[PDB]
Design a protein around this ligand. Structure first.
Ligand SMILES: Nc1nc2c(ncn2[C@@H]2O[C@H](COP(=O)(O)OP(=O)(O)O)[C@@H](O)[C@H]2O)c(=O)[nH]1
Ligand SMILES: [Mg+2]
Length: 248
């Protein structure tokens, strides 16, 4: 059997380091490669470093493209453990999609020297997805991680969405626009949210009728949408990074 695997992650979180650790040492930095383990093939794509699933540089749009449309049997989220409260922002955006997800915490060797120990399971409950801590430069933990991934892929990932409620005013707006994306390849909720935030990427697949139905909905949120969404996301991220984080 074959497995499409997308390693998306924050820039300088060790994403290319891990890619070369697993496989081996089209213009843009979309580096693909295959390895095999126990009779099952993998197709690893290195999605360029991004902080958000929205649009920016060009590489941003490039990476955002494959996040939403590529067939991916699993999405490995490469997150640097040293700076968690930033890197969890994109991890927060990825869980909304309901795509098969892992949170691979990297630089655990460097995090360990900081006297920062993390409640990886209290973190795991907040996110509702497997959280795997490792050092990518330690190729013993990479050899073991190959087995960790292959078992996860075969059994499937059990996922619970993240309890982000954005205020009942926004939730009413979301539940009106979810009909449009009910079938879609990712969560209808995330696409309705990203349409309310007015992502040009999302609106492209919307007709004039649907575009101007969403355009209506934006002027219904009498509080600034972009400001509101970040406020709720900070609310969740901060109460997360206080609970799971121990420093000595
Ligand atoms: N101390 C430490 N440094 C790491 C670890 N993993 C990656 N790095 C560093 O992260 C740097 C950049 O990673 P890179 O492969 O460029 O990731 P990308 O920028 O997301 O593609 C490398 O030069 C490594 O030195 C780790 O486990 N421990
Ligand atoms: Mg606006």
């Amino acid at each position: 059997m074959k497995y499409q695997v997308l390693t998306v992650g924050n820039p300088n979180s060790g994403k290319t380091t891990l890619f070369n650790g697993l496989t081996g040492a089209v213009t843009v930095e979309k580096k693909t490669g295959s390895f095999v383990h126990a009779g099952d093939e993998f197709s690893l794509t290195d999605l360029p470093g991004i902080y958000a699933l929205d649009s920016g540089s060009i590489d941003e749009s490039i990476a955002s493209r494959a996040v939403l449309t590529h067939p991916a049997d699993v999405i490995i989220n490469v997150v640097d453990a040293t700076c968690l409260e930033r890197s969890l922002y994109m991890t927060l955006q990825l869980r909304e999609l309901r795509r098969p997800m892992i949170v691979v915490l990297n630089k655990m060797d460097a995090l360990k020297r900081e006297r920062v120990h993390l409640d990886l399971k209290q973190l795991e409950a907040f996110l509702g997805c497997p959280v795997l801590a490792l050092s990518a430069n330690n190729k013993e933990q990479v050899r073991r991680f190959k087995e960790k991934l292959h078992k996860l892929l075969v059994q499937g990932i059990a996922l619970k969405q993240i309890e982000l409620h954005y205020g009942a005013e926004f939730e009413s707006l979301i539940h009106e626009l979810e009909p449009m994306f009910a079938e879609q390849a990712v969560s209808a909720r995330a696409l309705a949210i990203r349409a309310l935030e007015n992502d040009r990427l999302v609106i492209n697949g919307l007709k004039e009728a649907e575009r101007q139905n969403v355009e209506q909905r934006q002027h219904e949120c009498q509080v600034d949408i972009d400001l509101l969404v970040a406020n709720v996301r900070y609310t969740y991220l901060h109460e997360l990074c206080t609970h799971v984080r121990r420093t000595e």
